Design a protein around this ligand. Structure first.
Ligand code: HEM
Length: 184
């Protein structure tokens, strides 16, 4: 299902990435066909909350209106490479689906700077078939991918021309919920 051992950025700066702020997905590449929709909105917050490494996720399908949030405790495999549980929550952190063995994702930061990043994730959810998902992130939801992150896509032996943009979906995000979910 997933096939890639993504390599984390050399010299990854964890405190800068996990600073409590929001990252927007601007472009994505799924290696498995028919795995995710062709139009999508996603964002996350990443930070340490009371000593615990956390991510809060948001997904929105702009055609179906399917919406869900997750809160994730990350465990460290190596610098920039994590295994995350997930619990599905409402935007206020109330649990809808508890943490469960077999529901996890891996998360590898392949490149990051203050404004942009390239990540890989492999999602394992119960019975479902997994597939490699790469995402270009930016701190600014409207930013076109710049040369640092596009060069990193090339250095991963990927073609940025294959990535699908999220920019034409009228995506609107609740940054406040993502930040507050880090504590939940
Ligand atoms: C930003 C990095 C991402 C991470 C870490 C991530 C992680 C996850 C997790 C944990 C779930 C399961 C949530 C739950 O059931 O509670 C999920 C579901 C899903 N994600 Fe992502 N995701 C990311 C980005 C994306 C992107 C960019 C897309 C496609 C444009 C996408 C498409 C989906 C879809 C379609 C599901 C629903 C799968 C199902 O039917 O259960 N995700 N994702």
């Amino acid at each position: 299902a997933c096939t890639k051992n993504a390599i984390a950025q050399t010299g990854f700066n964890k405190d800068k990435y996990f600073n409590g702020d929001v990252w927007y997905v601007t472009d994505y590449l799924d290696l498995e066909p028919d795995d995710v929709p062709k139009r999508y909105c996603a964002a996350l917050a990443a930070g340490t909350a009371s000593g615990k490494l956390k991510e809060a996720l948001y997904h929105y399908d702009p055609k179906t209106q399917d919406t869900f949030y997750d809160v994730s405790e990350l465990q460290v495999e190596s610098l920039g490479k994590y295994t995350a549980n997930f619990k599905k929550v409402d935007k206020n952190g109330n649990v809808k689906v508890a943490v469960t063995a077999g529901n996890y994702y891996t998360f590898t930061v392949m490149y990051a700077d203050d404004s942009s990043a390239l990540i890989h994730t492999c999602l394992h959810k119960g019975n479902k078939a997994a597939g490699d998902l790469y995402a270009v992130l930016n701190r600014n939801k409207d930013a076109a991918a710049g040369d640092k992150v596009k060069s990193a896509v090339s250095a991963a032996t990927l073609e940025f021309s294959k990535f699908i943009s999220t920019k034409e979906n009228n995506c609107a995000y609740d940054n406040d919920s993502l930040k507050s979910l880090l504590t939940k």
